[PDB]
Amino acid sequence: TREARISRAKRAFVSTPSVRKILSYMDRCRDLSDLESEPTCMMVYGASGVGKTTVIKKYLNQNRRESEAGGDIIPVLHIELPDNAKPVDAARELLVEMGDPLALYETDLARLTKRLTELIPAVGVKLIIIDEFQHLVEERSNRVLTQVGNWLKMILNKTKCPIVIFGMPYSKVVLQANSQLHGRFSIQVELRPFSYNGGRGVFKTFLEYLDKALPFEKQAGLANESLQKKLYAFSQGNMRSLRNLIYQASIEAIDNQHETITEEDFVFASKLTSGDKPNSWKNPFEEGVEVTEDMLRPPPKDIGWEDYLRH
Amino acid sequence: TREARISRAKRAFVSTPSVRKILSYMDRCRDLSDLESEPTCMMVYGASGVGKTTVIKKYLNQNRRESEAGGDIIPVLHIELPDNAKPVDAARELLVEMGDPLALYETDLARLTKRLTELIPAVGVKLIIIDEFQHLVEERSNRVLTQVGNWLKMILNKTKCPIVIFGMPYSKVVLQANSQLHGRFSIQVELRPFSYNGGRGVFKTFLEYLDKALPFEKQAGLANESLQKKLYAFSQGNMRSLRNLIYQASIEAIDNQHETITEEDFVFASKLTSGDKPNSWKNPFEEGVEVTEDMLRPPPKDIGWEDYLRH
Amino acid sequence: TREARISRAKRAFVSTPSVRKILSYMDRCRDLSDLESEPTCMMVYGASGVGKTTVIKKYLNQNRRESEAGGDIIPVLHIELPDNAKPVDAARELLVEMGDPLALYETDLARLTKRLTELIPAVGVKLIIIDEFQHLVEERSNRVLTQVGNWLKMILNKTKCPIVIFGMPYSKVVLQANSQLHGRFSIQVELRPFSYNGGRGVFKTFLEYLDKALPFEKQAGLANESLQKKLYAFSQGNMRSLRNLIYQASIEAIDNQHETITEEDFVFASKLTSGDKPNSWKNPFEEGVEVTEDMLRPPPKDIGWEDYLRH
Ligand SMILES: Nc1ncnc2c1ncn2[C@@H]1O[C@H](COP(=O)(O)OP(=O)(O)OP(=O)(O)O)[C@@H](O)[C@H]1O
Numbered sequence: 001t002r003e004a005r006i007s008r009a010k011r012a013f014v015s016t017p018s019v020r021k022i023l024s025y026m027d028r029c030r031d032l033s034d035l036e037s038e039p040t041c042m043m044v045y046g047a048s049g050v051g052k053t054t055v056i057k058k059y060l061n062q063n064r065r066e067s068e069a070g071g072d073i074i075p076v077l078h079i080e081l082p083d084n085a086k087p088v089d090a091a092r093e094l095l096v097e098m099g100d101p102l103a104l105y106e107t108d109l110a111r112l113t114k115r116l117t118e119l120i121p122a123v124g125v126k127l128i129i130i131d132e133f134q135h136l137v138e139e140r141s142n143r144v145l146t147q148v149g150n151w152l153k154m155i156l157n158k159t160k161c162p163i164v165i166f167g168m169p170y171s172k173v174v175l176q177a178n179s180q181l182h183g184r185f186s187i188q189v190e191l192r193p194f195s196y197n198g199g200r201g202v203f204k205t206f207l208e209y210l211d212k213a214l215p216f217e218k219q220a221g222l223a224n225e226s227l228q229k230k231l232y233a234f235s236q237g238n239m240r241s242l243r244n245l246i247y248q249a250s251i252e253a254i255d256n257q258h259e260t261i262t263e264e265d266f267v268f269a270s271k272l273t274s275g276d277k278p279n280s281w282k283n284p285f286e287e288g289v290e291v292t293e294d295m296l297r298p299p300p301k302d303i304g305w306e307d308y309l310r311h
Numbered sequence: 312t313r314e315a316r317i318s319r320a321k322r323a324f325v326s327t328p329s330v331r332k333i334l335s336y337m338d339r340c341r342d343l344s345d346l347e348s349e350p351t352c353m354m355v356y357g358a359s360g361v362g363k364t365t366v367i368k369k370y371l372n373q374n375r376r377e378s379e380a381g382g383d384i385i386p387v388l389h390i391e392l393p394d395n396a397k398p399v400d401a402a403r404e405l406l407v408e409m410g411d412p413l414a415l416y417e418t419d420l421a422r423l424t425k426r427l428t429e430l431i432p433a434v435g436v437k438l439i440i441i442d443e444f445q446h447l448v449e450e451r452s453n454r455v456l457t458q459v460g461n462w463l464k465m466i467l468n469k470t471k472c473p474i475v476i477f478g479m480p481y482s483k484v485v486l487q488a489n490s491q492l493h494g495r496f497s498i499q500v501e502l503r504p505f506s507y508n509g510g511r512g513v514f515k516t517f518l519e520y521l522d523k524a525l526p527f528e529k530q531a532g533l534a535n536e537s538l539q540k541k542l543y544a545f546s547q548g549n550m551r552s553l554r555n556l557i558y559q560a561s562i563e564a565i566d567n568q569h570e571t572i573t574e575e576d577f578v579f580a581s582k583l584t585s586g587d588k589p590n591s592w593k594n595p596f597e598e599g600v601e602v603t604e605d606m607l608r609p610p611p612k613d614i615g616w617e618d619y620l621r622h
Numbered sequence: 623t624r625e626a627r628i629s630r631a632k633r634a635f636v637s638t639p640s641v642r643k644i645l646s647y648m649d650r651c652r653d654l655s656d657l658e659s660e661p662t663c664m665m666v667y668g669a670s671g672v673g674k675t676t677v678i679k680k681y682l683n684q685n686r687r688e689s690e691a692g693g694d695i696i697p698v699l700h701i702e703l704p705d706n707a708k709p710v711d712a713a714r715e716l717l718v719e720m721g722d723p724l725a726l727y728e729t730d731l732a733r734l735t736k737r738l739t740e741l742i743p744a745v746g747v748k749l750i751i752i753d754e755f756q757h758l759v760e761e762r763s764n765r766v767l768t769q770v771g772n773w774l775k776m777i778l779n780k781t782k783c784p785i786v787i788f789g790m791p792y793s794k795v796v797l798q799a800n801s802q803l804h805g806r807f808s809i810q811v812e813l814r815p816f817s818y819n820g821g822r823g824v825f826k827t828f829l830e831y832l833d834k835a836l837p838f839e840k841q842a843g844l845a846n847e848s849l850q851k852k853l854y855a856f857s858q859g860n861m862r863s864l865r866n867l868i869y870q871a872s873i874e875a876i877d878n879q880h881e882t883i884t885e886e887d888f889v890f891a892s893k894l895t896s897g898d899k900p901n902s903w904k905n906p907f908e909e910g911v912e913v914t915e916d917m918l919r920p921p922p923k924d925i926g927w928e929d930y931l932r933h
Pocket residue numbers: 010012013014015016019047048049050051052053054055239240243
């Protein structure tokens with residue numbers, strides 16, 4: 001099999017214009033603020049499993065590498081607020097990820113804020129990439145905790161730094177509660193999945209570049225009107241499901257060695273990674289079942305609101 | 312880009328007569344009280360994102376600079392109460408802000424008040440500026456806590472000093488609860504946003520002075536009946552949204568160098584900072600869409616009551 | 623402006639026959655009790671911003687000054703109970719006010735009582751004054767806590783001294799609950815605001831004495847049939863509102879120096895102190911409108927019951 005081929009098969013990153021826009025907006029949002037006046041700020045929406053973490057890692061790799069290699073600078077962070085997050089727990093994390101491992105033994109929203117606001121300029125933070133806000137909305141109850149959003153408002157008033165605050169599109173409610181919290185985070189973005197299935201667009205070139213990035217030296221197997229339609233039929237929007245199917249196909253192709261990912265391992269790959277899909281969803285690969293046009297309607301505008309619309 | 316141009320592009324402060332009145336009333340309220348008799352006291356209302364913090368910063372810059380440069384005096388303060396504020400938390404913040412970091416570890420509304428009342432005359436405080444009262448009114452429940460109000464009453468009764476107590480216009484309910492605290496703070500002010508859109512008033516001269524403050528040497532582009540109506544069409548009252556559009560528009564003129572902020576960067580800058588706006592609100596810049604007179608009505612009298620009228 | 627003029631302008635205290643009655647009754651209440659038999663006791667009702675604290679401070683200044691100048695005697699005490707008062711917290715305040723810093727760190731209704739009872743005769747307390755009974759009644763619920771009143775009964779039974787217990791009139795409800803506490807506090811008083819507005823009464827002589835106390839050398843400007851009714855229209859009962867208007871007027875007179883407080887600064891003074899007044903109230907000074915006799919009806923019998931009658 002060889003570790004490098006499977007490694008490169010898993011790490012086959014190509015950039016959709018949405019990702020390029022987000023990377024440009026991040027680079028902008030970083031370059032704009034001079035760590036003196038009130039920062040510009042930003043919020044990304046996206047959905048459940050599109051590539052938010054991957055975009056953050058891609059940004060971290062190009063940005064933080066050379067600065068971190070020099071010494072203890074770490075210009076950019078990676079935060080992930082816990083389940084039913086409180087300002088203590090957020091600030092505890094903000095400290096934990098930022099160099100110093102101390103201030104987690106016995107601190108209760110007193111001196112941790114002061115030392116965090118004192119050390120942020122000293123260490124040299126130029127941006128904060130917060131990843132998680134799905135937790136601030138409660139699971140059963142329709143209530144949303146504001147304490148964290150207010151604490152973010154206060155630390156943003158105290159120390160000046162751009163904040164990116166990634167979170168599912170139902171997390172908008174978190175901002176809608178507190179007036180100027182909605183007001184402050186003005187610049188806003190959708191990282192929504194692929195809409196059109198027909199081809200000769202973003203999906204076709206994405207699969208073409210992906211097939212160029214795949215480990216097999218016998219050219220692209222995908223980018224054909226017959227095959228592309230079934231891949232969209234399998235994975236509607238979620239790039240996770242698509243990349244999983246491609247990965248499962250690739251490892252099935254290198255196993256009992258083949259030249260390309262031909263129409264024989266896709267049926268197994270599809271049957272394998274069809275656990276997360278609903279009962280209503282149908283597998284296009286399972287048998288001789290012709291893909292239907294009505295099934296390939298674009299993903300709803302309420303794509304990441306399902307968890308919120310449960311209650 | 313050059314940091315100085317972008318710094319001066321961000322920091323382009325001009326004073327509307329409302330701000331001048333607040334600065335005059337602040338100067339008055341400080342000059343009146345002689346730290347012996349009962350103080351005159353003051354409350355500023357305003358709304359969510361008009362210029363409350365900026366008015367306080369402008370006052371702090373002109374007042375506190377020369378005094379603070381001398382030594383440990385700090386004649387004026389800046390306080391910001393936490394979410395669901397309690398007298399312990401407000402007093403802890405009052406002490407934490409006042410130089411000395413002690414009385415932070417273990418104090419339970421016992422000796423912190425006595426030492427605060429003892430040290431306030433010693434350091435030489437001439438006025439206090441409390442910023443935030445939105446927290447005292449609960450999010451879900453209609454209840455408003457008066458513990459902080461009675462502590463403010465008690466500390467005002469014990470030690471004599473002017474207090475400015477900023478807070479969004481639904482914060483009035485905090486005063487309306489406690490009969491004395493309503494009667495104590497007699498001097499009252501609106502820092503409400505701009506009303507008229509047509510021109511030849513406060514908005515036109517504000518934009519004209521802002522254009523004179525902008526970094527471009529090729530004169531003013533704004534303050535024209537053709538253009539300035541769309542700026543009011545974009546941002547009804549909130550100066551935040553206007554200044555954000557101006558900043559992004561300016562940034563987009565420095566990037567791929569231009570002479571002035573002409574009608575080409577405004578469209579993308581408008582599309583950029585159209586996240587905080589409601590779904591009902593329409594973008595005038597997006598396409599060839601002529602602004603409608605009915606949309607340019609003045610902002611409602613209940614401008615900062617929405618959060619209260621939710622519940 | 624000068625500190626002496628503004629100091630004397632603020633500190634312009636003249637005595638109302640009601641104040642003289644309270645002063646006489648308090649002097650009597652002190653003189654009668656010999657710290658051996660059961661004390662005579664007293665309760666003063668008043669209302670919000672009439673002059674209870676000023677009467678207490680006047681009494682403190684005339685009585686305690688000579689005794690305090692001699693040494694550690696402090697014959698008379700000042701207490702102002704915390705919000706949602708408990709016997710431990712009242713006793714803590716009663717101790718920390720009277721010299722001793724200790725009995726503050728760790729005391730839970732155990733030894734503070736005995737040491738208070740032991741050292742009250744030693745230091746030589748001839749009378750006690752509690753400022754507020756609003757805290758015993760809850761904000762939301764109509765329920766009243768008896769613990770503080772029962773502790774007052776208990777400590778009155780143990781250490782026998784006069785207790786004056788000032789508090790806004792619906793505080794009567796606190797005594798209406800506990801019959802024995804009601805029985806003890808027999809001597810009772812209204813410190814009610816000014817009722818008559820016609821002229822040639824307590825209001826005219828009060829204003830004349832105030833004008834004699836004002837800093838301007840060239841005789842009284844007020845106490846005229848033209849101005850008295852307008853001053854009464856502005857401030858119905860509340861002496862706070864009246865004295866605030868007089869103060870603000872006096873400042874607007876000494877600023878851009880005039881000969882006297884003319885009826886050109888009263889419009890600004892009235893406009894400035896127009897925050898705490900309800901929407902139903904109409905400002906007489908604002909425009910050139912003749913004041914209506916119907917609006918100058920005397921204030922109601924339940925003047926300081928509104929906040930209690932809300933629920
Ligand atoms: N341009 C791209 N080319 C190829 N694969 C991509 C690209 N962008 C994202 N992916 C893949 O899509 C998947 C995104 O998963 P990821 O965990 O980043 O999603 P997420 O929305 O952040 O979810 P999570 O809640 O797990 O953080 C990964 O398998 C990643 O490799």
